[PDB]
Amino acid sequence: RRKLRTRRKVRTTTAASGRLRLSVYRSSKHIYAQIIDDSRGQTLAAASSAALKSGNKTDTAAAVGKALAAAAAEKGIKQVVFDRGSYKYHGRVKALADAAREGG
Amino acid sequence: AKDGPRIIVKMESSAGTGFYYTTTKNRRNTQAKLELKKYDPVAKKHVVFREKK
Amino acid sequence: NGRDSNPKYLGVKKFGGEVVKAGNILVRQRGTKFKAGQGVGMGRDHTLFALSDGKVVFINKGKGARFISIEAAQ
Amino acid sequence: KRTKFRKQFRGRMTGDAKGGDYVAFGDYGLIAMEPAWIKSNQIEACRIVMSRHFRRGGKIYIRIFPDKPVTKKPAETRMGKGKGAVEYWVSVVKPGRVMFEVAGVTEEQAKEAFRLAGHKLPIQTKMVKREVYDEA
Amino acid sequence: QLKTKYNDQVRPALMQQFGYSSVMAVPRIEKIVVNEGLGSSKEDSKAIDKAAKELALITLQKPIITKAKKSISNFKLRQGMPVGIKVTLRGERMYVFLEKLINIGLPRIRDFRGINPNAFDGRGNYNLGIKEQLIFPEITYDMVDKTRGMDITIVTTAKTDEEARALLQSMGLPFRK
RNA sequence: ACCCCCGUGCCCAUAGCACUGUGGAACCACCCCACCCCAUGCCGAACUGGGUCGUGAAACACAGCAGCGCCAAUGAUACUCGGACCGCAGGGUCCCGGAAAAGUCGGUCAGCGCGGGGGU
RNA sequence: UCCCAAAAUGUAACGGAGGCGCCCAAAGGUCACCUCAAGACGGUUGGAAAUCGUCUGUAGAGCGCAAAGGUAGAAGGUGGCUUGACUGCGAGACUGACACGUCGAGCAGGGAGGAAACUCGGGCUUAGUGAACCGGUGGUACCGUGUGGAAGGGCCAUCG
Ligand SMILES: [Mg+2]
Ligand SMILES: [Mg+2]
Numbered sequence: 081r082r083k084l085r086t087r088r089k090v091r092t093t094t095a096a097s098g099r100l101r102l103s104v105y106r107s108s109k110h111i112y113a114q115i116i117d118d119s120r121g122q123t124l125a126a127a128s129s130a131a132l133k134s135g136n137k138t139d140t141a142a143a144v145g146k147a148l149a150a151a152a153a154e155k156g157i158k159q160v161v162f163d164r165g166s167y168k169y170h171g172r173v174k175a176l177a178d179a180a181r182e183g184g
Numbered sequence: 185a186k187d188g189p190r191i192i193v194k195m196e197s198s199a200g201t202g203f204y205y206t207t208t209k210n211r212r213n214t215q216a217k218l219e220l221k222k223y224d225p226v227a228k229k230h231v232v233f234r235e236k237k
Numbered sequence: 238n239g240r241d242s243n244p245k246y247l248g249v250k251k252f253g254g255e256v257v258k259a260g261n262i263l264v265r266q267r268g269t270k271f272k273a274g275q276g277v278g279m280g281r282d283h284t285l286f287a288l289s290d291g292k293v294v295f296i297n298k299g300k301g302a303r304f305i306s307i308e309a310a311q
Numbered sequence: 312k313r314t315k316f317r318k319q320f321r322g323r324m325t326g327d328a329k330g331g332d333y334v335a336f337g338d339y340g341l342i343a344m345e346p347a348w349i350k351s352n353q354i355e356a357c358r359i360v361m362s363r364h365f366r367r368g369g370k371i372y373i374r375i376f377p378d379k380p381v382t383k384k385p386a387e388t389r390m391g392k393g394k395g396a397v398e399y400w401v402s403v404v405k406p407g408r409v410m411f412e413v414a415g416v417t418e419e420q421a422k423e424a425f426r427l428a429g430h431k432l433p434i435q436t437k438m439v440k441r442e443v444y445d446e447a
Numbered sequence: 448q449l450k451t452k453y454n455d456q457v458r459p460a461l462m463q464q465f466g467y468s469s470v471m472a473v474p475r476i477e478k479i480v481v482n483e484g485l486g487s488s489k490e491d492s493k494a495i496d497k498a499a500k501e502l503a504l505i506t507l508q509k510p511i512i513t514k515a516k517k518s519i520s521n522f523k524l525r526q527g528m529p530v531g532i533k534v535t536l537r538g539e540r541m542y543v544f545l546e547k548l549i550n551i552g553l554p555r556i557r558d559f560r561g562i563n564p565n566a567f568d569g570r571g572n573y574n575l576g577i578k579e580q581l582i583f584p585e586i587t588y589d590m591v592d593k594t595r596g597m598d599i600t601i602v603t604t605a606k607t608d609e610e611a612r613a614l615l616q617s618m619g620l621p622f623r624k
Numbered sequence: 625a626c627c628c629c630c631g632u633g634c635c636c637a638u639a640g641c642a643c644u645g646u647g648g649a650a651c652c653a654c655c656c657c658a659c660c661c662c663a664u665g666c667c668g669a670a671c672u673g674g675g676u677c678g679u680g681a682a683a684c685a686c687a688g689c690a691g692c693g694c695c696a697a698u699g700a701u702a703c704u705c706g707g708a709c710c711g712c713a714g715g716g717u718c719c720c721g722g723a724a725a726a727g728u729c730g731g732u733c734a735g736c737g738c739g740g741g742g743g744u
Numbered sequence: 745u746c747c748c749a750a751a752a753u754g755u756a757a758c759g760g761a762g763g764c765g766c767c768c769a770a771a772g773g774u775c776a777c778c779u780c781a782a783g784a785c786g787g788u789u790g791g792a793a794a795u796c797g798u799c800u801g802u803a804g805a806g807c808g809c810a811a812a813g814g815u816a817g818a819a820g821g822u823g824g825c826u827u828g829a830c831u832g833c834g835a836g837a838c839u840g841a842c843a844c845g846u847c848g849a850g851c852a853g854g855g856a857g858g859a860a861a862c863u864c865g866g867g868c869u870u871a872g873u874g875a876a877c878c879g880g881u882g883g884u885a886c887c888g889u890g891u892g893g894a895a896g897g898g899c900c901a902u903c904g
Contacts, residue, residue: 081670083779086817092861095275099861105631108652109675112631114739121633123739128631130651130741138674161861168671168776169859170662177859185873186765187904194903196882203883205901208829215769221827222855229854233827239392239758243745245870246846247813248753250838260836262847267869268814280847282869283814286837288849298636320760322748325714327702346714392758446727471654472681478669482796484789511666513795520793531795535667567786570798574787598788600797604682 085165092163094118099161102148102180106173107166109137113148113176115160125151141172145179152184160184199225200232208235253295256310257287263305276307312351313400314378320393321380331408333443336372340412341425345434348401349410351377357411357428364424370414377402410436449542457617465610474571474605474614479541481506482598483532487523495529497592502534505585506544510534548599549619551584561623566612571605573615 092101097118105112113127127148129140136143152160160180167173187194192211197204204225210216220234251263263285264271273279274296278286291307298304325346334340354373361371379402383395404410411428413421425438458473467473483498495512502510513531518524536544553559556579567574578596580586588594605611616622 083817084671084777087776088817090817097861101861103632110630110651110741112740114631116632116739121738123632126631126739128740130630159861162859163861166671168662170672172673174859181859192767196902198882204831205882206830207902209768211768213768218769221769223827223830224854226831226853229831238761241745241762243871244754245745246753246839247870252752258836259850260834260848262837265838265847266814267812269819269868270814278847278849280869281867282847284838284847284869286848302636318761322760329702348714390758393760467681469679469681471679478667478797480796482788484795487794488789509666516794518794522793524794533666533796535669535796537667537669540667565786568798569785572786572798574797576787578788596788598796600787602797606681 084167088163088165092161097161099159100124100157101161101163103163104165104167104173104176106141111141111144111176113144113180115148115152115157124155124157127151138172142175142179145176146183148176149180149183152180157184195219195235196237197223197233197235198237199223199234202227202231202233206233206235210235251287251293253293255293257291257293257307259287259289261287263287263293271303271305274304274306276309277305312355312377314376314380317378317380319380319396320382325403325405328405328407331405332445333409333439334441335409335412336374337370337412337414338441339414339421339425339438340409341429341436341438342407342409343404343432343434343436344406346403346405347433348379348381349375349377349404349432351400351402353431353433354402356431360428360431361411361413361424364420364427365413365416368415370416372412373410375402375404375408375410379403404434449546453542453618457614460617461610461613464613472606474603474610476541476545476601476614476618477604478535478537478602479545480600480602481510481532481534481536482600483510483534484596484598485512485532486528486530490523494593494595498532498595501580501586501591502532502597505583506534506536506540508534508536508540546619547584552582553621555584556582561621564612564622566608568611569608571607571611572603573601573611575599575601 094101095118100118101116103112103114103116105114111127111129115124115126116122117124125148127144129137129144133140162177164173169177191213192209195206195208195210197206197208202225204223206221206223208219210219217236219236220232222230223233224231225233247265247267249264251257251261257263263277265285266283269283271283271285273285274294276288276291278288280286285305287307289307289309291309294306294308296304296306331342333342354375354377358371358373365371377400379400380396381398381401382393383398385394411425413424416424422438425436429436453476458470461467461473481502483502485494485498499510499512511533512529513533514527515525515530517526519526553562562575575598577599580595580597581588601615603611603614605614
C-alpha cells in the first residue's frame with residue numbers, strides 16, 4: 081500500500097542524477113507540486129493550488145502545472161525529474177506534467 | 185556444453201541479406217519453431233534476423 | 238567425504254582511507270552486503286567499483302545495510 | 312543416554328565451566344572438580360546405582376545428556392578415512408558443572424548416593440549444599 | 448430496488464437501541480465472497496465448466512478459479528492446479544444477489560429451519576454454511592450437468608459481534624429461535 | 625514572534641507496539657456518484673474521474689501513559705598481546721596491559737531541517 | 745558451497761557434509777502492479793493440511809537445482825511491449841608462477857521499454873566447463889612462388 085510511493089523514490093536516483101525532483105500529492109483535491117533538491121532537503125519554487133481555485137478542484141490540474149513552470153523561470157531550472165507516488169500517470173496528474181513541460 | 189540428441193541445440197544465425205551469426209542456445213522443449221528475432225549485422229541495422237538454420 | 242573442495246576468495250580490496258581511481262575494485266562479495274554508495278557502482282557479482290577518483294569511505298547504519306561512498310579530494 | 316538424531320561426527324576441546332550451577336531442581340547436588348569426558352554408559356552406572364539406594368522417590372535429575380559422538384578403531388591399518396561412526400556418546404564436563412542432584416531424602420541418605428555414584432566417575436567430585444541464588 | 452430499506456430499517460434503528468455518535472461508525476456490508484469446492488476428490492475438466500457457468504448466472508459475475516497453494520502432502524495434492532473458486536460480490540452486484548438470498552434463496556429451501564445463531568467470526572463478521580444448490584431461483588436441474596454445493600461468506604464492517612448480529616437480522620436473516 | 629496542519633528530508637526502534645484521551649469543516653480521511661479516458665486474470669475495494677452533506681468513528685495527527693520492546697552503566701569476571709612457570713597428561717597458575725557477553729542500576733516512546741497553508 | 749580456517753587473504757589430510765557437467769523464448773530487457781510462512785477464530789463434497797473471510801505476523805517464506813551470503817523500498821509474485829542473450833571498444837582494478845578467469849564507467853554505430861530521469865552489452869551471485877594441433881560450414885577478398893585466374897592457404901564468426 082505504501083509500496084507504490086517508495087518504488088518511485090528509491091528508483092529516482094538522487095545524487096548520481098545531479099538533477100532535481102518534482103513531487104506530487106494528488107490523492108485528494110490539493111496538489112502541492114513541490115520541488116525538491118537532490119542533495120539538500122530544501123524547496124525552490126514550490127507550487128500549490130491552495131490560494132484560490134475558482135470553484136475548480138479537478139480542472140486546475142493543468143493550471144497549477146503551468147503556474148509551476150512559470151514560477152520556476154524565476155529561479156533557473158532546466159531539468160526536472162518527476163516523482164509521483166501511487167499515481168499511474170493518468171489524467172489529473174498527467175496535466176501537471178504536460179503543462180510544466182511546455183510552459184518551462 | 186555436451187552435444188547429443190538430447191533436447192535444446194546450438195543455433196546458426198542468418199539474416200535478410202545479412203551474413204552474421206549470433207550463436208544462441210535454444211531448446212526444442214517448448215515452443216520450438218519460431219527462432220526468429222532481430223539482430224542487426226554490421227550494416228544499416230534493423231534487418232529481419234532469424235537464427236533458424 | 239575427502240573429495241570435493243574449492244579455493245574461493247572474496248573479501249575486501251580497498252579499505253577506508255585509501256585513495257581510489259576510476260575503475261578500482263572496492264569490495265567483492267556474493268550477495269548485497271555492501272550496497273553501492275555514492276561514487277560507487279555494482280557489478281553482476283555484487284562486485285563494487287569506482288566511477289572516478291577520490292577516497293574510500295565506509296558507512297554503517299547498524300549493520301544490515303552497508304554503504305560505500307567516494308569523497309573526491311581536489 | 313544417546314541422542315535421537317544428530318549430524319554424526321565431532322572434534323575435541325576443553326574450556327572452563329559455563330552453564331553449570333550450584334543448585335536447582337532439588338536441595339543437594341554433586342559437582343565435578345576435574346575436566347574429563349563422561350561416557351553415556353557411566354551415566355547409566357550412576358543413575359542405576361542411586362536407584363538401588365532409593366526405593367521410591369524418583370527425584371534423581373540428570374541434566375548432562377551426552378551430545379558428543381566419538382570414533383573408534385575397527386581392526387587395524389590406517390588406509391582409510393572416518394573410522395567407527397557408532398561407538399559411544401560422551402558428555403563433556405568441566406569443574407563446577409553439576410552432574411547430579413537429589414532431594415527429599417536426608418543428609419546421610421544423600422552422602423551415600425553421591426558417594427557411591429562417585430567411584431564410577433573418571434574424576435573427583437564433591438557434594439554441596441544450598442545458598443545460591445543467581446538467576447531464576 | 449433495495450438500499451432504501453437498507454438504511455431506514457437499519458441505521459436509525461441502531462442509535463435508538465445502541466448509541467452511535469456517527470452515521471459512519473454504523474455497521475455496514477462490505478462484501479459477500481462465494482467459494483466453490485471443486486476438483487481434488489473429483490478431478491474433472493468437465494466439472495469445471497459446470498460451476499464456471501452456474502456461478503456466473505446466479506451472481507451475475509465471472510468467478511476466478513483459484514488454484515492450489517503449491518502444497519504437496521501425502522494424499523492427492525499437486526503443485527498449481529485449479530481446485531477452488533472465488534466469487535466476490537461487492538457494491539451493486541452485492542445487494543442484487545443478497546436480496547435474492549433473503550427473499551428467494553433461504554425461504555425456498557426444503558427442511559429449512561433457519562441458521563445457527565451462535566456468534567461466528569468474532570471480529571464483527573459472519574459466515575454462512577450453505578450446501579445444496581437445488582434451492583436457488585437461478586439453478587435449474589432441468590438444464591445443467593450435475594448437483595453440487597456452494598459456500599457464502601458475509602464480510603461486514605462491524606466492530607463487534609453484538610453489532611454484527613443486529614445488522615444481519617435487521618437486513619434480512621432468519622434464526623432458529 | 626505563537627501555535628497548528630500538510631508535504632518532503634536528515635535520522636533509519638534510547639524516535640516501536642498496546643492502552644487511553646483530544647481534533648472537526650483551514651487541513652486530512654471516510655463517504656457519494658462514476659455510461660465514458662484508466663483499471664482490478666472477479667469485483668471501480670485498491671488504481672481512477674467527477675464532488676455535496678455527514679462524521680472523526682476508522683485512518684491519520686497530537687498528547688498522556690513506558691505493562692511489554694528497544695537502549696544500556698559502574699564493579700567484577702571470561703578471554704587474550706608480553707613476559708615468566710607447573711603437571712605424565714587432559715590442563716592450570718603468576719606478573720603487566722587491553723578488555724566481553726549477560727545480568728543489574730538506569731535511561732528514555734525523539735530530536736534536528738526546508739517549503740507551503742490556515743488561524744492569534 | 746559450508747566446516748577445519750585458529751576474527752585480512754591464504755592454508756593440508758584416505759578430515760567432517762551436500763551439489764554440478766544443466767535449464768529457461770522465457771525464469772530475458774524494461775515498464776507497471778501485488779506481498780509471504782504460519783497460528784487462532786468461524787464456515788459447505790472438507791473434517792490433518794488445503795479452498796474462503798477477518799486479525800496477528802520483520803517474513804519464522806520465497807528466490808528452478810547444493811550451500812552460504814543477501815533480499816520487505818526486492819535479486820518474492822503477475823501483465824503489456826520487445827530481442828541489448830547487440831556490434832566496433834574499454835580508463836582502471838581484483839586474481840594466478842605462467843596460462844586463464846572476474847568486475848567495469850565511459851565513447852561510437854544502431855535499437856528496446858517508459859511521459860520522463862533512466863536503465864539494458866543474458867539470468868541474486870558464486871559450479872552447469874577445457875589449451876594447442878587437425879578438420880567442417882558461412883562470410884569476406886589478404887596471399888597465391890612468369891603473368892592473369894583457379895586449387896589451396898589466411899582472417900571474422902562458428903561447429904567436432
Ligand atoms: Mg582468518
Ligand atoms: Mg601435436
